[PDB]
Amino acid sequence: SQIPRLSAINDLHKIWPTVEEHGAAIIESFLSLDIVRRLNEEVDPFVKIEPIPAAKTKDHPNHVLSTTTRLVNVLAPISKAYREDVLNSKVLHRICSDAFHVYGDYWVLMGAVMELAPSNPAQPLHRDMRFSHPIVEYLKPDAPATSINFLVALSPFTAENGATHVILGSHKWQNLSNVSMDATVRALMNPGDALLITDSTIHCGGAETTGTETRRLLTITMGISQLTPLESNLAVPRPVIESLTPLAQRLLGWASQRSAAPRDIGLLTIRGNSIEKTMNLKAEQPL
Numbered sequence: 001s002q003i004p005r006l007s008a009i010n011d012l013h014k015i016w017p018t019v020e021e022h023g024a025a026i027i028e029s030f031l032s033l034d035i036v037r038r039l040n041e042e043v044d045p046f047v048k049i050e051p052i053p054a055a056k057t058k059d060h061p062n063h064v065l066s067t068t069t070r071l072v073n074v075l076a077p078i079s080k081a082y083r084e085d086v087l088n089s090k091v092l093h094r095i096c097s098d099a100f101h102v103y104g105d106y107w108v109l110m111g112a113v114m115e116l117a118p119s120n121p122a123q124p125l126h127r128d129m130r131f132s133h134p135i136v137e138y139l140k141p142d143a144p145a146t147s148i149n150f151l152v153a154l155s156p157f158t159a160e161n162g163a164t165h166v167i168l169g170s171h172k173w174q175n176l177s178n179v180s181m182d183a184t185v186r187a188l189m190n191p192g193d194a195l196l197i198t199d200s201t202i203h204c205g206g207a208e209t210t211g212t213e214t215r216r217l218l219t220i221t222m223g224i225s226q227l228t229p230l231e232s233n234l235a236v237p238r239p240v241i242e243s244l245t246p247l248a249q250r251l252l253g254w255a256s257q258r259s260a261a262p263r264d265i266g267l268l269t270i271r272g273n274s275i276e277k278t279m280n281l282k283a284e285q286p287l
């Protein structure tokens with residue numbers, strides 16, 4: 001049984017129901033190739049200078065990722081394509097509002113480019129969020145997913161170059177005794193395609209077997225606004241913030257947030273008023 005493949009335009013309403021049922025779907029042409037090109041060009045130098053995940057100069061080293069992984073997050077100050085095109089993706093927002101409506105507003109838990117060096121080994125099969133949000137393990141097993149992960153190919157995903165592994169249905173597994181690479185299927189994808197999984201989907205990056213190809217992806221973990229993002233936009237220059245849409249501002253933590261509770265009293269408010277109202281935060285002011 002293979003990962004279902006859906007069109008970003010044609011099949012839009014089918015995407016989240018497909019993930020909710022099977023734990024994974026491939027969104028074909030999630031980002032256009034022109035956006036992929038621009039993202040790539042804009043993040044390239046930051047990828048090249050990024051040290052190892054656990055670099056000694058970091059005061060929050062990532063000890064989990066392999067030394068042949070590079071991960072660059074807080075993309076808004078680096079990439080116009082990301083902060084305009086990606087953060088405003090209609091497809092992305094329709095899926096997130098489909099996924100998160102029971103909880104409320106959602107935001108970017110982390111937007112990162114990952115680049116894997118040739119011969120990068122397969123990651124251990126895993127669910128996300130367990131090195132950041134242990135609260136998630138305490139959720140009842142039937143609780144709606146509180147985060148999801150769009151793994152967007154910025155270069156080709158093939159079985160040979162380490163395309164992601166997923167276990168279909170594994171987001172509903174309580175008993176993990178059956179986890180093995182035996183149960184996986186691959187996300188074979190063209191640049192701009194996205195693999196969409198939930199925080200309970202068991203998955204892993206694949207083994208890069210060519211010894212030559214450098215695989216790159218954009219991972220967008222979207223999560224309910226009641227959960228703290230893994231990354232901070234607090235240091236993004238205010239001019240950059242004020243060039244965004246209000247929606248993009250909210251996604252980066254530069255706006256207040258709402259839950260779905262009928263009498264919701266809000267998140268990140270100030271004596272009854274929003275961040276953006278208190279600070280008189282402008283939007284869509286070009287640089």
Ligand SMILES: CN1C(=O)c2ccccc2NC(=O)[C@@H]1Cc1ccccc1
Nearest residue numbers: 064065123124126127128129130131219
């Ligand atoms: C550790 N880890 C990340 O760094 C990561 C990277 C991109 C997007 C999400 C994310 N969150 C995570 O929880 C993963 C978990 C993991 C990663 C590699 C091997 C085993 C487990």
Ligand SMILES: O=C(O)CCC(=O)C(=O)O
Nearest residue numbers: 128163164203204205206
């Ligand atoms: O490399 C991949 O395709 C998967 C990345 C991943 O699962 C993670 O880093 O949490």
Ligand SMILES: [Fe+3]
Nearest residue numbers: 126127128203
């Ligand atoms: Fe993962």
